[PDB]
Amino acid sequence: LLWGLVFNNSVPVQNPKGTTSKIMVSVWAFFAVIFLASYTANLAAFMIQ
Amino acid sequence: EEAPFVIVESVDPLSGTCMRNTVPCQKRIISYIKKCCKGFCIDILKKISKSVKFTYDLYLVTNGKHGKKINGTWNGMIGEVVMKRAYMAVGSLTINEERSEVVDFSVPFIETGISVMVSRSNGTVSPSAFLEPFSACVWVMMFVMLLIVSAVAVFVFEYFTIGKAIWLLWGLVFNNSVPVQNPKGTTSKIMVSVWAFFAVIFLASYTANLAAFMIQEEYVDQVSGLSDKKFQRPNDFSPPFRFGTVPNGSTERNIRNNYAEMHAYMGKFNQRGVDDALLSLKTGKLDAFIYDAAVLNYMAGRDEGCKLVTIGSGKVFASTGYGIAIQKDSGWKRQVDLAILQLFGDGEMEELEALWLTGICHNEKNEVMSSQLDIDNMAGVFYMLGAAMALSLITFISEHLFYWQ
Amino acid sequence: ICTGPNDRHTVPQCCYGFCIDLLIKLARTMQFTYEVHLVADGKFGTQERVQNSNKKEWNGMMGELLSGQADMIVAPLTINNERAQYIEFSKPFKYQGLTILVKKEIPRSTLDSFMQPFQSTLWLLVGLSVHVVAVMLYLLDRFSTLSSAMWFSWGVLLNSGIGEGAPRSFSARILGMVWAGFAMIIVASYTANLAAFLVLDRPEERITGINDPRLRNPSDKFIYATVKQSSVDIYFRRQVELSTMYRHMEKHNYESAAEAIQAVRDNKLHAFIWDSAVLEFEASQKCDLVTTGELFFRSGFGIGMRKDSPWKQQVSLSILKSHENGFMEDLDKTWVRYQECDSRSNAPATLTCENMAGVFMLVAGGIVAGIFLIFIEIAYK
Amino acid sequence: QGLTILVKKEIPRSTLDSFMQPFQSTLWLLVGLSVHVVAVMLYLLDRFSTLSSAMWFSWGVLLNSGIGEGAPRSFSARILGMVWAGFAMIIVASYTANLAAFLVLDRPEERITGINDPRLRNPSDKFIYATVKQ
Ligand SMILES: *[C@@H]1O[C@H](CO)[C@@H](O[C@@H]2O[C@H](CO)[C@@H](O)[C@H](O)[C@H]2NC(C)=O)[C@H](O)[C@H]1NC(C)=O
């Protein structure tokens, strides 16, 4: 699941229950969305030189 | 010398009194303390002497002023031509009427007037940022295709609920809000998988284009002109900002003696010496600056970096010219004119200009990265959010509206 | 009133305008009674040899002043040296210069089709490789759910959430974990390339003044000229460093000053040389046509008088004092300042439907493919 | 041969500082407030014709995750969330665009160009340069 989330949501799976777990995973998703975004940003540079 | 039109320079012990290409300003100023001078108008005198061919001294002014009078008594270079102690005066000098009356004036050779200088800008971006990358047409064709494909889903699953498929589909465009009941049936799934393709192309193309509007220019950023309330109303719209000029000069009478408030308001924020205002505007001490045209159009183009630019140079205020002042009614006034009107034809004017006047920031500078705390320009989407909230409240009103029946 | 002899028809009509405004203003100062008429020849005038050895005459209104017909000129009459030897000029009231005209460059000319950033090869390449890896996963799961895996694969590329498949193996798992990475990479690179195409599509830079090197010697994609026998050639031909452009123009010349605008708007002239304050008032009105930012010949018009009228100095003083109160500025605002249109650098080219329509064609393709494919369920059942 | 000028290597990597940089702290807290705002609004609109549920749903959809299986049972909440999602997408989009802008138009400095470089027409004291005397 985690590895899948980074690469923009392959396929849903068994979501771990428990409030604390869900908090941690929701935090991880933030790092994800920042990462993929920054990637596309920079890869939109090398094609301008 | 009060500008990059005449330059004062001390004496050199090596090559005589000083270098070539300069002429001795031999002025027994205070009591034959020699200096020497070069620059722009010096060049034009060194070409006047090529078609009138006379001899001339070069002595400066007792008062170092620009020509305001008091009690009818005249100061400045004018003040020392009115008494005809000196047959002729050139250099940096405007042309008004109260000066045009005492003495005469030649044909002007470089046009000037009034403009404004201000620290340039930050990088602003239009509030319309969000809406830009599309014509409104696609934005309705969206709903069109949504409804038609939902009808096709009706046709398909004839062989969910149609008040629900819209939810899933509309969700998919905006990057996958939340999974819901996936309609079964192979044909349906094919149609929806097709729709997802349109989605991924759409969001992509969007981000692409919205990554353009933030790479082009902005920032007119300052004013319209002397007619703005910003100027004439000192505290109405924005209380604290303040500007000024330098007194003692020509550009006074063409504001005071025709405008009312700005004189009494600037009477508390004037600076002795020119570049004092440059220092002030370097560190935000003063907001705006008014002065002659050409001195400004030069002082900007040769700073460290063009953080200080004219307010839309194309507009000028009280456009007049420099010139060459002659004692009253001398027979020379014609020749010099006949003289100078040659040099405009022979291209030499542009030549001397390029010899002194050109500025560094002539090209359009890079539109700066606009890092944003800009709640202001992104506000429109928040306001559409609120509009959604209002649509929510009225839709809830519709609940009771049906409920009483 | 205006007695125009160029209707041989001398006809009384009316005339007005910026200059007329200045004249009617100035009148109140010095008690002027005045008829007004036009010039039969319809040209300014210059020194020209006549009778092939006899005299030097002025072929126009300037002569009409010197001849004894006129007594004062008010029109955009230029100032230079040559004329200054027989006239007396007031100070100049309206500076000006030399500029060029070109039609509006490009409002929206950027994109063609959505597949454009890729090229057809890689499309079919990934379209094959997806089924490839699909069936590979199928076998790897089968021998320690075919249509399932086919979905899973051909979906994960499409960001959807269709199907609840999964791998039960270990091999399939470790494979898909990077299949996903390839998926993300494709979409990323696609966005980047489309951004590049949309940001560095500079159509063309608006030609910059007379010193534009494209004019050092012109390509035939630069049609431009003046009106034959103007007062601009006195700086074109009389200058030596322009004789090449002089020859290009004498061959490319247009008929009338209005024919210039007619030809530019007709996509037959794509740049035009003239004075600033002659075109600039037509750009801000003919919104499809704008000027270049540069100034070439520094000069400003003025009022002409016969040599040593007893008020030369006087009218010059009045025109000075009347230039800074508000007359010239306000008269420009109400008479030369439409400000109707404002161009800028190459805009970021808002998207239109007509080049984004291509994807809707695949939408319609799905639509039509539906009612075909539907009965296949009924058949297979 | 000819006459040239020497300058050290200009910049190999001098671009970015921190990830929050393209935004500025104000809008961060603004959206952080508005998310709970719309959350509780949805809560009431569903409650009076599942609180922690809606709190998730909201504060998740911004984060692209797939956490929680909540939903709206009302009609008002539905029509509201349908555009809450749009605002979500818009924020991330604009964020990417701004970061791209910051990474593409950070020209540190252009290497000074020959003797006719105008910066040398009269030098700033940030231009130390000379020859060997005699
Ligand atoms: C220039 O303006 C200043 C005031 O704005 C005045 O300079 C004063 O300078 C003169 C000459 O040095 C002194 O006699 C006065 O006493 C100064 N004023 C005061 C209040 O002390 C003067 O009006 C102008 N002087 C010149 C030379 O232009």
Ligand SMILES: O=C(Nc1ccccc1)N[C@H]1C[C@H](C(=O)O)Nc2cc(Cl)cc(Cl)c21
């Ligand atoms: O070129 C011409 N006549 C011409 C007509 C048809 C074909 C060729 C030449 N006139 C010039 C000269 C004259 C002037 O005082 O500048 N009138 C005048 C006034 C304005 Cl506003 C602008 C110009 Cl260029 C002109």
Ligand SMILES: *[C@@H]1O[C@H](CO)[C@@H](O)[C@H](O)[C@H]1NC(C)=O
């Ligand atoms: C933005 O403007 C303000 C005041 O004008 C000042 O911080 C500075 O000039 C600009 N910012 C930067 C980073 O230069």
